[PDB]
Write a protein that binds this ligand. Structure first.
Ligand SMILES: N[C@@H](Cc1ccccc1)C(=O)O
Lengths: 52, 454
């Protein structure tokens, strides 16, 4: 079920949607550096191995 | 608006030497000594997998060149056996094999990348799952924003792989500079010894899923395979030799992580280098599978089996974004599981029977259609040799290890309901079709994506 480029691009450029994409594609990139902060916290908080 | 051709000969060997080298050589050589009994038969088994891979992969230059459509194993299957046989494969690829293959490599990326900070105990399990997901997400983004970036990343990690094995091998010959054993003959062990090697070489079949993006396929695809697969075989048997220059046979039979032992033996002040190289090897293999699998499900959408949203390309960025997001999201589900490994050990056979059915299909296609153009032709003796050896190593090894087939065939037959609902159907439930269209245009407006214009 294909739908036309020249149909979609009547709606796809509208202010609410381009704002929505900037919001989500920022929230994702913030979520990812959130994964990184979470992991680095766990790695620092975890007790390191016994010495041989 | 179509997937723009961007893969060179150079990046075309990076995708294959990229996906092959992986974790296999650094953590599965113990898995051949445990069956072979001896470093003598081990060096043979590691060479025997090489030639068997080369004949297989050159038999894949036939399917590669004769059918440009680049669903790889799935397109070649659809072209011969038709819609339902190909769909059960694509369902298995979608649901189990391709997400779990990415995820366990993401986990293996974590446990080795973190090992320099955890030198003698398990890494914190939650940290390992977070770092696994950070890898799959970062490589999904690096695949969305440029195919030329993604393949430059494949190049970078193909270099990282060959640096790692060069460092192993030169220490091997330095160790030799300072100056075979009793062996089994039982075929019931030899098939298991050899089958344990086919995991390491596995992945030569990957380049075929991206042929439609490769810039001059009738040269570049055949030439990439024969450039790569000999250099894979050489660094593999020389790496497998290098381990026996340093490690006692009894040590390797025990070893949790063979490359870490070799690194700790020689480089003790800075041995953490080798864990980092095996980690970065795995990172590049996640990329290999993301890149390659998103093209499979794109093809599976445009060849009319899968839901339509997965066909839709981003028209400014020229990447099949919903298929990259779909494979990312399917991968991250596996982080929310514990030790599914027994069914994965079953489905490891399913890929080999797909290679068998496809390459059987190559002769079947040769006899039913000698009219076709064939930009290269293969001596029929090589498929005749390869198909029997493949079906032997499937059949005998399966009889020795039918590990979880009760759940295995539970999953395989679960594709047939979805075929009757999604591919066979006469589309009677019009209330659902309004939802299908609505959610489709939602995804198209959200992701900003447009179908393949044939
Ligand atoms: N050889 C790959 C594993 C693999 C097996 C089978 C198919 C594809 C890939 C690795 O070591 O990462």
């Amino acid at each position: 079920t294909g739908l036309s480029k020249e149909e979609l691009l009547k709606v796809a450029g509208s202010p609410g949607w381009v704002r929505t994409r900037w919001a989500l594609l920022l929230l994702f990139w913030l979520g990812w550096l959130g994964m990184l902060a979470g992991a680095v916290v766990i790695i620092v908080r975890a007790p390191r191995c016994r010495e041989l | 608006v179509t997937l723009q051709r961007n893969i060179t000969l150079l990046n075309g060997v990076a995708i294959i030497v990229g996906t092959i080298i992986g974790s296999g050589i650094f953590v599965t050589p113990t898995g051949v000594l445990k069956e072979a009994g001896s470093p003598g038969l081990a060096l043979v088994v590691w060479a025997a997998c090489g030639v068997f891979s080369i004949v297989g992969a050159l038999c894949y230059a036939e399917l590669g060149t004769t059918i440009s459509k680049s669903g790889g194993d799935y397109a070649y299957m659809l072209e011969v056996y038709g819609s339902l046989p190909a769909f059960l494969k694509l369902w298995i690829e979608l649901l189990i094999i391709r997400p779990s293959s990415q995820y366990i490599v993401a986990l293996v990326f974590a446990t080795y990348l973190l090992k320099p900070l955890f030198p003698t105990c398990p890494v914190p399990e939650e940290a390992a799952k977070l770092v696994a997901c950070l890898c799959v997400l970062l490589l999904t983004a690096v695949n969305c924003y440029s195919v030329k970036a993604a393949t430059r990343v494949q190049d970078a990690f193909a270099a990282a792989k060959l640096l790692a094995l060069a460092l192993i091998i030169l220490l091997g010959f330095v160790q030799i500079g300072k100056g075979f054993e009793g062996t089994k003959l039982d075929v019931g062990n030899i098939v298991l010894a050899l089958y344990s090697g086919l995991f390491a070489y596995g992945g030569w079949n990957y380049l075929n899923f991206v042929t439609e993006e490769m810039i001059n396929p009738y040269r570049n695809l055949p030439l990439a395979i024969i450039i790569s697969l000999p250099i894979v075989t050489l660094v593999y048997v020389l790496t497998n030799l290098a381990y026996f220059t340093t490690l006692s046979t009894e040590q390797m039979l025990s070893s949790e992580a063979v490359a870490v032992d070799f690194g700790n033996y020689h480089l003790g002040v800075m041995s953490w280098i080798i864990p980092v190289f095996v980690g970065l090897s795995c990172f590049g293999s996640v990329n290999g599978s993301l890149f390659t699998s998103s093209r499979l499900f794109f093809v599976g959408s445009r060849e009319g089996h899968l839901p339509s949203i997965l066909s839709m390309i981003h028209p400014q960025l020229l990447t099949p974004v919903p298929s990259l997001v779909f494979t990312c999201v399917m991968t991250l589900l596996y982080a929310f599981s514990k030790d599914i490994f027994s069914v994965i050990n079953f489905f490891s056979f399913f890929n080999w029977l797909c290679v068998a059915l496809a390459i059987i299909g190559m002769i079947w296609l040769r006899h039913r259609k000698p009219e076709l153009e064939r930009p290269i032709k293969v001596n029929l003796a090589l498929p005749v040799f390869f198909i029997l050896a493949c079906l032997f190593l499937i059949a005998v090894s399966f009889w020795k290890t039918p590990v979880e087939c009760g759940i295995g065939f539970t999953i395989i037959l679960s594709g047939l309901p979805v075929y009757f609902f999604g591919v066979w159907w006469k589309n009677k439930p019009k209330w659902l079709l309004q939802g299908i269209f609505s959610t489709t245009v939602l995804c198209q407006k959200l992701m900003q994506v447009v179908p393949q214009e044939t």
